């Protein structure tokens, strides 16, 4: 869940 | 689901 | 997109 | 896909 | 978040 | 992100 959320965070920041 | 998937597709254009 | 990412942010903070 | 959906389900327990 | 999670649930059941 | 987006695309094939 920590890894998925950081990827979602990167997806939204891009 | 059509709208959501459209938005996810746009996110995945990065 | 802005709304979706705000929701994903909240989901991930929960 | 099975792991991702399991993670999404967990996220959605809020 | 309720609506989004209902959509993600539907996406994951397929 | 490439892997996550591939999974989201497949999920969106429904």
Which residues in chain C are closer than 8 Å to E6, comparing Cβ atoms?
none
Would the CA dihedral through C10, D6, B13, E10 be positive or negative?
A: negative
Which residues in chain F are closer than 8 Å to B8, comparing Cβ atoms?
8, 12
Q: Do chains B and A touch (3 or more CB pairs under 8 A)?
A: yes
Q: Which of E3, A8, D11, C7 is nearest to F7 (CA)?
A: A8
Q: What is the DSSP letter of D9?
A: H
- Interface residues on A facing C, Cβ-Cβ cutoff 8 A: 5, 8-9, 12
Residue E4 · residue C11 · CB < 8 Å: yes
Residue A7 · residue F1 · CB < 8 Å: yes
């Amino acid at each position: 869940l920590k890894k998925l959320c950081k990827l979602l965070k990167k997806l939204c920041k891009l």
